């Protein structure tokens, strides 16, 4: 029963068990138009530590700690899927809703980009059934729902003792967002940069999951 | 289960205090991943506020001196005939050609801005681009 | 050697300055039945309509010419604490190439 203990104790001792430093650079984030922002009239107060500056009332994200944010953001996700995490891509935006719902499909995981029906996370125990494994990690691509308010699953998931690693805008509110990354969430180049990135982080985690399962049955 | 008070502290704090008090008999997964690899900012709940009085925003304006060169370039020539292709990374338009020539002519040391402007017009005419000044 | 301030000092959006009546090329990635969506770079896109001239010439993938009105078009109203956006920029169409 110690082999299961050792198979998870080993990856907790390195800053990159899957080497995710290579999965992006600062050049690709600039070349996927992530650094742009909304009008400075719509600029939110909690974004002032995550904004480089303002270009003619268009707000620029400080992309340096964005990578440092994304380093632990990808580190959190791929450590979780190593230990068989249930990852929920909640992204209430009807411009990339078709893209994301196959991203969880071809990464073996789950997504809910539809209208959020009421007691979803909180009253799970009769909406789904008596015993139901709730998601252990919930990724947000658009934290604003289509009325430009905080999506209720942001307020719901952290209430359910579940961490949230979102893409946070320059008009969002990253208060109960545990591993936010300040990024554009509106352009198709930027969300395709995301949808390629999280797809890589799950899949790079899963092949190094299966090899150490072969490592127990290597000797025995 | 545990707590649903999102306003007590961060989720790591409540889960830590709750498992350490030992009512919880099972430690969650993301807890081990959290204290193993922590985030930069603890995500503790904050009610937002509103700036009142002489408080303003500490987010600056982003300017350069080449922006001031582009200012007089746009006041005279407007946009040049070269329509911008913003998929082009190194799209050096007539504003960019004007300002690059202006910088390497400020490297001459002509203090007068008008002869810098005019010799820049001559360097662009030596390059081969027709200037569409509203005369 | 390549820093962050280096990437956006001479970036084209800083190169062109303010988007008050400047010529820009932009392409088509979505069409709904009257309307074509013009992704010209920057944060959002703009939507416009098929003119009768070159009617089925404006298709999926063609470049057009834009006049570039302002990039987001937001305004705070009377009793709102924050302005609402439209996620558009809505420039004026000219022609091709």
């Amino acid at each position: 029963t110690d082999f299961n203990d050792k198979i998870l104790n080993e990856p907790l001792k390195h800053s990159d068990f899957f080497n995710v430093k290579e999965l992006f650079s600062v050049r690709s984030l600039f070349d996927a138009r992530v650094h742009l922002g909304h009008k400075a009239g719509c600029r939110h107060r909690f974004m002032e530590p995550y904004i480089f500056g303002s270009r003619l009332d268009h707000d620029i994200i400080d992309l340096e700690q964005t990578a440092t944010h994304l380093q632990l953001a990808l580190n959190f996700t791929a450590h979780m899927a190593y230990r068989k995490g249930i990852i929920l891509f909640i992204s209430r935006n009807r411009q990339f809703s078709y893209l994301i719902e196959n991203m969880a499909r071809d990464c073996g995981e789950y997504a809910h980009t539809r209208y959020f029906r009421g007691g979803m996370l909180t009253n799970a125990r009769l909406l789904f059934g008596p015993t139901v494994r709730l998601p252990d990690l919930i990724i947000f691509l658009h934290t604003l729902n289509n009325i430009f308010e905080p999506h209720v699953a942001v307020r719901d998931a952290a209430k359910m003792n579940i961490p949230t690693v979102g893409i946070v805008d320059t008009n969002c509110n990253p208060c109960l967002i545990t591993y936010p990354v300040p990024g554009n969430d509106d352009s198709p180049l930027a969300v395709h940069l995301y949808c390629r990135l999280f797809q890589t982080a799950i899949t790079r985690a899963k092949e190094k999951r299966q090899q150490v399962e072969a490592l127990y049955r290597l000797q025995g | 289960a545990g707590s649903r008070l999102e306003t007590v502290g961060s989720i790591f704090s409540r889960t830590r205090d709750l498992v350490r008090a030992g009512v919880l008999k099972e430690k969650p997964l993301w807890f081990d991943v959290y204290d193993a690899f922590p985030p930069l900012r603890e995500p503790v709940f904050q009610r937002p506020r509103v700036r009142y009085g002489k408080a303003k925003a500490p987010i600056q304006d982003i300017w350069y001196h080449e922006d001031r060169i582009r200012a007089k370039f746009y006041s005279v020539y407007g946009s040049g005939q070269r329509a911008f292709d913003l998929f082009n990374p190194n799209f050096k338009s007539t504003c960019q050609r004007f300002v690059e020539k202006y910088t390497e002519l400020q490297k001459l040391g002509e203090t007068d801005e008008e002869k810098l402007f005019v010799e820049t017009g001559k360097a662009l005419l030596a390059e081969g681009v027709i200037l569409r000044r509203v005369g | 050697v390549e820093s962050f301030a280096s990437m956006l000092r001479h970036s084209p959006l800083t190169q062109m300055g303010p988007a008050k009546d400047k010529l820009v090329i932009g392409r088509i990635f979505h069409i709904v039945e009257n309307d074509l969506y013009i992704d010209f770079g920057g944060k959002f896109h703009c939507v416009c309509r098929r003119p009768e001239v070159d009617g089925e010439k404006y298709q999926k993938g063609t470049r057009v010419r834009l006049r570039l009105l302002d990039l987001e078009l937001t305004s705070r109203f009377l009793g709102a604490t924050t302005d609402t956006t439209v996620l558009e920029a809505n420039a004026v169409l000219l022609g091709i190439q």
């Binding site: - | 600056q60 300017w63 922006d67 | 820093s3 301030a5 300055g17």
Partner: peptide
């Protein structure tokens, strides 16, 4: 490093439109 923006007084700023009878008496 030297590409850092420098806090100056906002170019591209249009000069404010006087009324039609402004400099007149």
């Amino acid at each position: 490093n030297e590409d850092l923006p420098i806090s100056m007084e906002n170019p591209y700023k249009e000069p404010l439109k006087k009324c039609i009878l402004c400099g007149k008496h």
